[PDB]
């Protein structure tokens, strides 16, 4: 036997398509483990999930377990350097993150496959001896504060906390989990708390092996992975901590039959209906709540949504079970509201209860369960191979809930038909345990309560006994019918043999005036799926703000019109994306190849013969107006949006679109559509389980459907225009300044434009960014604590590129600027001082990043798709660019920096976007020139040259 191992699990049930090998085990100290051996993987990975989270925070230090999560990255006894962990990952093509929920704290990384042990050794120390360094603590409290700051004016986060504030205040559910400077520093200081000791005590009390689950994925054998995990994780102490449990629901009697009227930040209009329920987690083999969610949340003919939409009351609906914690759950039915729907909330809810009564009247349906089961089994068998980092993180969470042997299957395979459970949950969905919340600007000034953590304005009322009784008497409405058999359920899963003329990259198999067809039969994944991507080119989609508006409305009305039909396909693993672009339209159809030609045909047919329902036009127009207005409530880092506007030849602002929108009439839209479709060019990628002849057939079916119904003719080659990037002058510095009216933080984007994309320019820029990537985070966030959001990397647009920095902060942008410049000098010196081997590690790390193989079809499709829509068509880019990268020296990167990037660089091309807050041993910052302040974007663009477009490969 082995004393360090309590038990090795039996065979871990997996898909027969899954070539990864698995071993489950439990260590002597109680840690549940899953080992995943993948000898092909480019990146290895591990995750650990501790079954403790913010619900276990001390009542007097809100945010403590989340603060602890940040602090674990900042040094341990074995590895005391504050950024040892993150630096090691960066230098070895790795990445890491962590999250805290109510009951879990989950930590994960990936890394180059040959450096798993080194990454895992550093990771393991988090759970053994963190330093909680006193200086680290005082700095990092600002990252958490800034994290909360960004959430404060976010409508979703405000509602999340409001639900908690309106249940039983004595229940742990009411806790504020994020924490901030006040809860984590200021108040603790006022009350004599040694926060470092509190962190040490919480870690000591709760970071117990018996509450932990670890997952490791690597190229190593299952035996080698076993020895690794035993080696590193056997020393975690078992303190036999009881798993927290919350059997009493936070919503008791006095919290039920309540109405909440809420003022949002954005101009949004929503209704939230919720019912307290028992914890259904244990019923995973039958899943009664999913069955009810499927039915109540259905969007097909006869559904709840269909009738509410027909009445003109709501546009979208989400229904089903929602997690609480061990011991409690919620069942929800949430809808957005039209203006008319806001006046008919009572009637909307009556319809909800009529639908529920129909479920009660028909009884549980085994055939519905069977579909659900069948679909889940197909989904499991043919699941796309996951990226290691997300996969390990997900399994570590669910190891706490299922037997070892079932961790892969448990969330998919359904086994038991349980009409007793379906009825039991259905018996909870009654007017006497309903909570109702309306979110609307119309409640502005009419509220009398304030939620303390976010400031949310609301009013709480008892629902009148007469309203309840009316809902209790809901009878059958003839508009409500159960769904019928889902005919999109796929049955043909045959993988076509690999054709003799098959190619490693997409081949251009059709090149006509009307269409350009790129094709690749899948030679890697061998799942019965395909991706069909189409760009429709028409200059008429973006000619002016009006036409851009009409393009948008057209496609939104089309999706709205197809919804009832497309929903069945979606349940059956067949989806589509349809959107307007600056060049025309984009269509993507993905999923099981079987029924895929049928959905595609329907989309093009509907496109080309579209007739608009006037009521839907008016509703969707009003939603779009609000959507344009609501951009005002987006986050300051806005900065990105202004830079895009500034740097692109043609771009309509949100303001211009807003103005043009009133001029969108039904007559005008009806005229626009045939004009849009009259002349087109189509560029397509058809990629997956499909032959050349099926691909050619699909392409021509799309053309013929347009030709037939819309009389489409080809666009002139010259009309296939692409937009250029503005060309900044040597040594120029421009600043554009605006104010964010909603958020009380600044945002900045700094762009150092370099030159057109090419092999050499690409790799100079990418190597530099690789070298500065971790240091920028470490310097600008960890040390200087300028904000939660600190980003650096290549910016690529319209065939041009450069280096960008994005920061969101309480500090003014002019200050942010001087800190980024101080940082840039630090990096020049750091590049001078680094060893030739440190330099080569960064080359190798970038190389691994660029060569990492797609694990699934759509990831491979997206790479080819990027080559196609950018018109570079460089399908072998990675090998070619990496071969050149390996050639680079320190002097090359120094010369590049000195020529293009240094403050005194002869070819420095700098543009800054400064977004001001609503209310508006540090290294030496260099002196900066006076910027030219941009007053008018049009004038700015007029006064500068435009770059060329990049030549196709």
């Amino acid at each position: 036997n082995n004393p360090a191992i309590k038990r090795i699990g039996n065979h871990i049930t997996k898909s027969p398509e899954d070539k990864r090998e698995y071993r489950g085990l439990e260590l002597a100290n109680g840690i549940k483990v899953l080992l995943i051996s993948d000898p092909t993987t480019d990146k290895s990975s591990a995750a650990l999930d501790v079954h403790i989270g913010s619900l276990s925070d001390p009542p007097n230090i809100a945010g403590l377990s989340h603060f602890l999560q940040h602090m674990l990255f900042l040094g341990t006894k074995k590895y005391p350097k504050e950024n040892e962990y993150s630096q090691f990952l960066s230098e070895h093509a790795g990445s890491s993150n962590a999250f805290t929920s109510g009951e879990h704290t989950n930590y994960y990384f990936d890394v180059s496959h040959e450096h798993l042990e080194g990454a895992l050794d550093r990771f393991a120390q988090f759970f053994l001896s963190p330093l909680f360094d006193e200086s680290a603590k005082d700095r990092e409290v600002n990252a958490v504060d800034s994290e909360h700051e960004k959430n404060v004016m976010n409508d979703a986060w405000r509602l999340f906390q409001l639900e908690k504030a309106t249940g039983n205040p004595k229940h742990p559910f009411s806790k504020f989990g994020t924490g901030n400077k006040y809860t984590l520093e200021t108040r603790p200081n006022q009350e004599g708390i040694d926060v470092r000791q509190e962190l040490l005590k919480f870690h000591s009390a709760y970071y117990s092996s018996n509450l932990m689950a670890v997952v490791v994925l690597g190229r190593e054998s299952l035996d080698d992975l076993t020895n690794l995990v035993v080696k590193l994780f056997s020393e975690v102490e078992n303190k036999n901590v009881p798993l927290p449990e919350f059997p009493e629901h936070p919503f008791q009697e006095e919290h039920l039959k309540q109405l909440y009227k809420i003022v949002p930040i954005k101009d949004i209009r929503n209704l939230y209906v919720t019912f307290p329920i028992p914890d259904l987690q244990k019923y995973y083999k039958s899943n009664p709540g999913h069955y009810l969610g499927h039915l109540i949340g259905h969007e097909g003919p006869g559904s709840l949504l269909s009738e509410l939409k027909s009445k003109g009351w709501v546009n979208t609906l989400v229904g089903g079970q929602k997690e609480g914690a061990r011991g409690f759950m919620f069942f929800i039915i949430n809808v957005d509201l039209t203006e008319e729907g806001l006046l008919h909330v009572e009637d909307i809810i009556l319809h909800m209860f009529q639908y529920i009564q129909k479920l009660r009247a028909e009884g549980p349906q085994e055939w519905v369960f069977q579909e659900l089961k069948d679909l889940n089994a197909v989904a499991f068998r043919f699941k796309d191979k996951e990226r290691p980092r997300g996969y390990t993180s997900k399994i570590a969470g669910i190891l706490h809930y299922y037997p070892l042997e079932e961790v892969l299957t448990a969330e998919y395979l359904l086994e038991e038909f349980r009409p007793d459970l379906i009825e039991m949950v259905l018996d909870k969905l009654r007017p006497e345990n309903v909570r109702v919340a309306i979110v609307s600007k119309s409640f502005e000034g009419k509220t009398d309560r304030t939620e303390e953590w976010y400031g949310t304005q609301y009013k709480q009322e008892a629902i009148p006994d007469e309203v309840i009784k009316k809902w209790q008497n809901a009878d059958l409405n003839g508009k409500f019918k159960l769904p019928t058999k889902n005919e999109f359920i796929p049955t043909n899963f045959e993988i076509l043999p690999l054709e003799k003329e098959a190619t490693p990259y997409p081949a251009l198999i059709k090149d006509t005036a009307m269409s350009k067809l790129w094709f690749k039969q899948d030679d890697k994944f061998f799942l019965p799926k395909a991706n069909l991507n189409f760009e429709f080119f028409s200059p008429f989609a973006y000619v002016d703000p009006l036409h851009s508006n009409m393009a948008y409305l057209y496609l939104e009305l089309l999706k709205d019109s197809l919804n009832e039909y497309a929903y069945a396909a979606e349940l059956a693993g067949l989806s589509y994306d349809l959107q307007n672009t600056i060049y025309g339209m984009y269509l993507s159809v993905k999923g099981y190849n079987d029924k895929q030609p049928i959905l595609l045909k329907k989309i093009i047919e509907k496109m080309a013969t579209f007739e608009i329902d006037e009521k839907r036009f008016e509703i969707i127009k009003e939603a779009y107006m609000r959507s344009l207005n609501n951009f005002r409530a987006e986050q300051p880092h806005h900065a990105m949006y202004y830079l895009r506007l500034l740097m692109t030849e043609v771009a309509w602002t949100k303001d211009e679109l807003k103005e043009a929108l009133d001029d969108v009439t039904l007559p005008r839209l009806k005229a626009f559509i045939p004009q849009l479709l009259s002349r087109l060019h189509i560029e397509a990628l058809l990629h997956g389980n499909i032959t050349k002849q099926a691909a050619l057939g699909i392409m021509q079916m799309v053309e013929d459907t347009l030709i037939e119904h819309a009389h489409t003719k080809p666009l002139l080659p010259s009309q296939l225009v692409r937009y250029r990037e503005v060309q900044l002058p040597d040594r120029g510095w421009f600043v554009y300044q605006q104010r964010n009216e909603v958020h009380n933080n600044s945002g900045i984007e700094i762009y150092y434009q370099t030159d057109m994309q090419s092999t050499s320019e690409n790799m100079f820029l990418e190597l530099f960014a690789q070298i500065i990537s971790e240091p920028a985070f470490n310097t600008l966030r960890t040390k200087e604590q300028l904000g939660y959001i600190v980003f650096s990397g290549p910016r690529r647009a319209n065939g041009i590129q450069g280096l960008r920095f994005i920061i969101q902060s309480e500090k003014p942008p002019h200050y942010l600027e001087s800190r980024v410049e101080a940082f840039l000098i630090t990096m020049e010196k750091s590049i001078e001082d680094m060893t030739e081997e440190a330099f080569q590690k960064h080359i190798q790390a970038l190389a691994i990043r660029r060569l990492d193989k797609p694990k699934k079809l759509s990831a491979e499709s997206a790479k080819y798709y990027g080559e196609i829509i950018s018109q570079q068509y460089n399908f072998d880019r990675d090998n070619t660019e990496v071969a050149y990268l390996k050639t680079l020296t320190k002097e090359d990167i120094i010369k590049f920096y000195k020529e293009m990037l240094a403050v005194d660089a002869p070819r420095r091309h700098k543009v800054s976007v400064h977004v001001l807050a609503r209310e508006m041993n540090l290294s030496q910052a260099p002196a900066l020139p006076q910027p030219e302040v941009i007053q008018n974007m049009t004038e700015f663009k007029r006064g500068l040259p435009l770059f060329p477009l990049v030549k196709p490969h």
Partner: peptide
């Protein structure tokens, strides 16, 4: 249709 956590480092 059928069916908030704190990051980062």
């Amino acid at each position: 249709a059928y069916r908030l956590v704190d990051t980062l480092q």
